[PDB]
Amino acid sequence: GASDFQTGIHKIVIQQSGDTDSFEVSVSIGGADKGGPAKLYNDKGEYIGDSYSAQIRTATMSCCTNGNAFFMTCAGSVSSISEAGKRLHITVIGYIDDKEVNRLEKEYITDGNTLIETFSVSTKEI
């Protein structure tokens, strides 16, 4: 093939801003390889499992693999339980090896009701 085929190390970045104090945001982190579920690593470069979830309880976030993977997934949800006009922004970006290959952004504001929403950013599709 001589087209868009790059795999191996998968890396991901998340950001949040706005009312971080009063928004839970939780992502299941994971992937697979030629060898079962792929290992994931934290932003200290150290492995921490082959499945888990992490709540965004930082300003910025990222996770990475080692070699042997064929995607990484970062799929999650938001909630809030506060007054109206609490605004939020989320930026969710996926990378492989040395390129960016996926991004979306999302924005939420409380209207008076419970806030709930969901999102997902995978670095490979079929």
Automatic annotation (TrEMBL):
This is Lipoprotein.
